[PDB]
Structure 1
Amino acid sequence: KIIHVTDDSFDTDVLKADGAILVDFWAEWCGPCKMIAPILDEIADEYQGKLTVAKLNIDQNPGTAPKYGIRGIPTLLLFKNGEVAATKVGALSKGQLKEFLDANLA
């Protein structure tokens, strides 16, 4: 359900994707990241059909993050039509994520 993205499949899975894609940039050592992982799993269920959730481990895929000016994690990028539509840095509750999503999905 949650796309496992890599440095090699980013361009095709995200840039050429047709729809709204939410990309989660994390790393095993990033606590705040591990804190919102459960929330993404649930968001994928509540937004099935109008949103696709993907995740990119920066340690294993150290190339993509820099091209998008990502200065730290956790950081979420909402791609729309092949381009960044909205950005969100830091951990957040279930509510803050839904409000952010509802407002930028319309």
Structure 2
Amino acid sequence: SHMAIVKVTDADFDSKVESGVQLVDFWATACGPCKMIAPVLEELAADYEGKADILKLDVDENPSTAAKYEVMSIPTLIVFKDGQPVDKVVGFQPKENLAEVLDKHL
């Protein structure tokens, strides 16, 4: 009923993924993209003081909300307008890009 997923590394990737059909799960124990986006959001919060709020929710500690908004990877950002979800950004994005997303809804 279960078979082990085969581990690949930078050293052997090109040899393992060469012929036929492979599905590769890019994963990690810790959330690197979550850490990368955090200071971006802190700078965005300062740039948008008074105009937009920036909040964070840990999905491992808060499964109910994470399930309600169908969060499937992390990080995922949901823009709310007056309590209603109006936009979604999946994964790390540069500050400039997130600003453009906020701007569309201000």
Fold equivalence (TM over 0.5): yes
What does residue 70 of structure 2 align with? 69
CA-CA distance at 1:88 after TM superposition: 0.6
Q: What secondary structure does 1:65 align onto?
A: helix
Q: What secondary structure does 2:105 align onto?
A: helix
Q: Which amino acid aligns with 1:88?
A: V
**CA offsets 1:33-84 (integer angstroms, 9 cap, x no match):** 1100001001110000111111001112122111111111110001111110
In the aligned structure 2, how far is the partner of 1:82 from the partner of 1:102? 17
| Structure 1 residues not aligned, in runs of 5+ | 1-27
Q: Which protein has greater RCO, CA pairs closer than 8 Å, 6+ apart?
A: 1
* Stretches (4+) displaced over 6 A: none
Equivalent runs, 1:4-83 vs 2, <5 Å: 29-83=30-84
In the aligned structure 2, how far is the partner of 1:72 from the partner of 1:66? 12
In the aligned structure 2, how far is the partner of 1:72 from the partner of 1:101? 21
In the aligned structure 2, how far is the partner of 1:92 from the partner of 1:79? 18
| Structure 2 residues not aligned, in runs of 5+ | 1-28
In the aligned structure 2, how far is the partner of 1:58 from the partner of 1:77? 13
Q: Which amino acid aligns with 1:78?
A: V
In the aligned structure 1, how far is the partner of 2:87 from the partner of 2:105? 7
Q: What secondary structure does 2:99 align onto?
A: helix
CA-CA distance at 1:87 after TM superposition: 0.7
Q: Which amino acid aligns with 2:31?
A: C
What does residue 94 of structure 2 align with? 93
Q: Which amino acid aligns with 1:57?
A: D
Tell me how large the CA RMSD over aligned residues is: 1.4
Q: What secondary structure does 2:79 align onto?
A: strand
